[PDB]
């Protein structure tokens, strides 16, 4: 899989060139970064909030564009929200690692497929 940033921050290799989606990706990196350093019930819920908002938006753009790989992508999103929606603070190290991995892998292995398509 792709390199997990340490510190856990977005960098330009994750860019999709759709400004609001890129800004959304930057806030999910920051949401996980904050849960790592302050593994609190508010930060977990903020993470769930910013990830649900991003997924609704990215799906709206894929549907508007009639992007034909939207259906497996939506399933990826649904499963992730179900997993982080089911967590409670403090999130254990396995699940923090899962989240760090999932974001990196999701943007470069799946969100990258819509580059120039939305
Ligand atoms: Cl890379
Ligand atoms: Cl095209």
From Swiss-Prot:
InterPro entries: Haemerythrin, Haemerythrin_Fe_BS, Hemerythrin, Hemerythrin-like, Hemerythrin-like_sf, Hemerythrin_metal-bd. GO terms for molecular function: iron ion binding; oxygen carrier activity. Fe cation 2 binds at residues 58, 73, 77, 106, 111. Gene3D superfamilies: Hemerythrin-like. CDD domains: Hemerythrin (cd12107). Keywords: Iron, Metal-binding, Muscle protein, Oxygen transport, Transport. It comes from the Eukaryota. The keyword Transport applies. Muscle. Pfam families: Hemerythrin. Fe cation 1 binds at residues 25, 54, 58, 111. Belongs to the hemerythrin family. Monomer. This is Myohemerythrin. It comes from Themiste hennahi (Peanut worm).
């Amino acid at each position: 899989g792709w390199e997990i940033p340490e510190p856990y921050v977005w960098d330009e290799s994750f860019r999709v060139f759709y400004e609001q989606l890129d800004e959304e990706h930057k806030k999910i990196f920051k949401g996980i970064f904050d849960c790592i350093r302050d593994n609190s019930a508010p930060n977990l819920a903020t993470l769930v909030k910013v990830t649900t908002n991003h997924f609704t938006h990215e799906e709206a753009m894929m549907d508007a564009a009639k992007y034909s790989e939207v259906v497996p992508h939506k399933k990826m999103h649904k499963d992730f929200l179900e997993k982080i929606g089911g967590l409670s603070a403090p999130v254990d190290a396995k699940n923090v690692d899962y989240c760090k991995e999932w974001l990196v892998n999701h943007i470069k292995g799946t969100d990258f497929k819509y580059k120039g398509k939305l």
